[PDB]
Amino acid sequence: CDYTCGSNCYSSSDVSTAQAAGYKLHEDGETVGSNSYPHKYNNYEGFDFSVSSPYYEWPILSSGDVYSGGSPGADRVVFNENNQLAGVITHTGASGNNFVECT
């Protein structure tokens, strides 16, 4: 696993595929789903990402398919304005409604 979000195993290609879809919607000024993804990720957690902000979050699914406006699940891909990967985060293993980084 390139990224492990709890029990979910993601390859660098799974991440790139998810990021490409979120980035396209972001550039178009459109959102999908009840929680309006992609949307700004403020970094309340204070992760030390090595790429510049603003950051946007988009769901990454354990099933392998691109988020299509339904349930977002626990996992997210975080990218910036230049389509650079900031990180992969999850609610799994975090307290409250916070996120932890996938390893």
Ligand SMILES: Nc1nc2c(ncn2[C@@H]2O[C@H](COP(=O)(O)O)[C@@H](OP(=O)(O)O)[C@H]2O)c(=O)[nH]1
């Ligand atoms: N845990 C966490 N959730 C975030 C972060 N940024 C955005 N979110 C979630 O996305 C929601 C919508 O994002 P937005 O703020 O960019 O519009 C936020 O709602 P709240 O505004 O109630 O915090 C929050 O629940 C962040 O840095 N950490």
